[PDB]
Structure 1
Amino acid sequence: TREHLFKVLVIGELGVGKTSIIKRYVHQLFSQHYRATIGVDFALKVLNWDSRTLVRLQLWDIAGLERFGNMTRVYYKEAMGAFVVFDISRSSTFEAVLKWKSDLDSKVHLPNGSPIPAVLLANKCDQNKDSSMSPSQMDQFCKEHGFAGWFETSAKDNINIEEAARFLVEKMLVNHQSF
């Protein structure tokens, strides 16, 4: 087995679900109880991509506050890709994704100089739909602002977190054959 190791950013506004997405993916746990993340948290996901390949994900959990604090250049550096997350149940947090996206792209490139693969997550999809945004519009949105793709997810109920992880790993393994 060749082994890969990918730094993956998880970013987006406060209470949006970032920590819980990670905690689900890595430890299958969910709490309803909101503990605000303080600066940056970290987690490690190992997975068996196939017979021949192991990948290892460094998950960088970035407090939604930290975008007002000029430490983001430090956290982002040499990131291999990103989940940008918002809360389907709060339209304000969706408007925010373009703030976070700007920040990200203006401060981390691939080795090529191209922007890094970013996957948009519409989290808390187990509640009711607030952003006034059809699937065909998400695609237009992603297409316009340089997201690789998007996903409705729930850490509560384990919707779509696996599939999003794979979609992003797939993108980044392609990029490892470009350098």
Structure 2
Amino acid sequence: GSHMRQLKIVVLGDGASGKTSLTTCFAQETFGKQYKQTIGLDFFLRRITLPGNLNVTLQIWDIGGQTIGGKMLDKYIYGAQGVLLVYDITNYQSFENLEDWYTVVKKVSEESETQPLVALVGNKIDLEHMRTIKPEKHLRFCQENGFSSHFVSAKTGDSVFLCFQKVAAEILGIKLNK
């Protein structure tokens, strides 16, 4: 027998960073019958084919309005093979607070004996000329913790598909060459 290959990715970060915009931007290609199959659930599914004709379904979880201490947060983070730490490049506190989001991820990782792929996602790159987190500051946070680095715009779609695709590939031990 052979079963579906599914990877769970959770999207974390402070309110107003663009988490729901980001997840929706990636979900849009599935709108119609497939997205409707999980309407009102905690996640949606999107199938991608990674290089080498590797079919995988991504199960993408938006935490909604959950805060760091939310007692529902566990179902989002436990089992997550990929984690997006999302901030708004124009909102400094959203970046600073990612240390605290990452503390929860480390705690879950240690308990679960897992090593999820963690991506730092600077959203709103369409607003680059008004950013309050410089690229160098973002890349320092990535270097300190081994995060995958992404600058995206959920509004316009810039780099969004590639962020999820790269995270999926890295979960499976593949560095995509582009």
Provide TM-score, normalisation by structure 2: 0.79
Aligned-pair Cα RMSD in Å: 2.5
State yes or no: 1:156 paired with 2:152: no
Q: Which residue of 1 aligns with 2:118?
A: 118
State yes or no: 1:79 paired with 2:113: no
Q: Which residue of 1 aligns with 2:33?
A: none
- Displacement of 1:27 in angstroms is 0.6
The 5 Å alignment of 1:97-176 reads: 97-109=98-110, 113-127=113-127, 128-134=129-135, 136-147=136-147, 149-174=148-173
- Displacement of 1:50 in angstroms is 4.4
In structure 2, runs of 5+ residues without a counterpart are: 31-40
Equivalent AA in structure 2 for residue 23 of structure 1: T
The one-character-per-residue Cα deviations of 1:28-83 (angstroms, maximum 9, x if unpaired) are: 59xxxxxxxxxx83111111224642110111101243323233233211211111
- Displacement of 1:115 in angstroms is 2.8
1:102 partner SS: helix
More helix by share: 2
The one-character-per-residue Cα deviations of 1:74-104 (angstroms, maximum 9, x if unpaired) are: 3211211111100112111001111111111
Q: Which residue of 1 aligns with 2:49?
A: 48
Identity of aligned residues (%): 25
Equivalent AA in structure 2 for residue 12 of structure 1: G
- Displacement of 1:109 in angstroms is 4.9
Distance, in Å, in 2 between the alignment partners of 1:144 and 1:103 is 17
In structure 1, runs of 5+ residues without a counterpart are: 30-39
Distance, in Å, in 1 between the alignment partners of 2:111 and 2:102 is 15
- Point out 4+ residue stretches in structure 1 off by more than 4 angstroms: none
Equivalent AA in structure 2 for residue 75 of structure 1: Y
Residue-pair matches, total: 162
Equivalent AA in structure 2 for residue 118 of structure 1: V
Residues 2 and 52 of structure 1 are in contact (CA less than 8 Å); yes or no, is this contact kept in structure 2?
no
Equivalent AA in structure 2 for residue 124 of structure 1: K
Q: Which residue of 2 aligns with 1:20?
A: 21
Provide TM-score, normalisation by structure 1: 0.79
Distance, in Å, in 1 between the alignment partners of 2:139 and 2:102 is 16
